[PDB]
Amino acid sequence: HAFRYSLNYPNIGHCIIINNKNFDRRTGMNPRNGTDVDAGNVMNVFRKLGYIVKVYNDQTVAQIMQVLTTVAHDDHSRCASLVCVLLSHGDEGVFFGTDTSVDLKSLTSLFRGDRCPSLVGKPKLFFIQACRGTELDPGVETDERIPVEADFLYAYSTVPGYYSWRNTMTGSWFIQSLCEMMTKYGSELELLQIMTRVNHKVALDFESTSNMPGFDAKKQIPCIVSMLTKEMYFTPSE
């Protein structure tokens, strides 16, 4: 059929980063210090690959809806793909604007095939750094028609139900691992191969340190959800 998504387009595509740091006091949510380190790394990595990167800082739900609805109604005929990086608080199934929460389904379904015709058949890649609940992982010691939901990737920082971890100096565990593995393998491996090595790095090299009771020595594994129908490479040749 065609084993890999085509890069035969003027632009590899757009990279939209929603980077939320400071939250409405009334929500009780804390600032996400170190998220600027995350967003800056992501920006340079996807700029190097040729994406047109745009960063939106401290966005409310309705501002996110607006930004993403404009991108979905834009024309992507000349783009090979779409990348969206989401950095915020969250809970199970939801993402936080600066003001309150919104269903992730509401963000991503804006790019469904029947609502975004210029991206039909093209990879729509979402990287989501946000909590998905409040559980902690204690770790364990060892020794043609197509479906409208097709061609999405949802690379979540953590398992459903669980907290996701962030360092205030180096940024979130998942995003600094993604940037390091993109930089090292972005021109040699395909995306799910890259994400498996993200998984390994987060799983093995990070463990929490905290004096807050119950929060010490915890682990994290990311959760890579693929509806992709082809291999995704970021360069024409390996």
Binding site: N30, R32, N33, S88, H89, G90, Q129, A130, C131, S157, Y163, S164, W165, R166, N167, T168, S172, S208, T209, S210, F215
Partner: peptide
């Protein structure tokens, strides 16, 4: 280390 902080959770999100």
């Amino acid at each position: 280390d902080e959770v999100d």
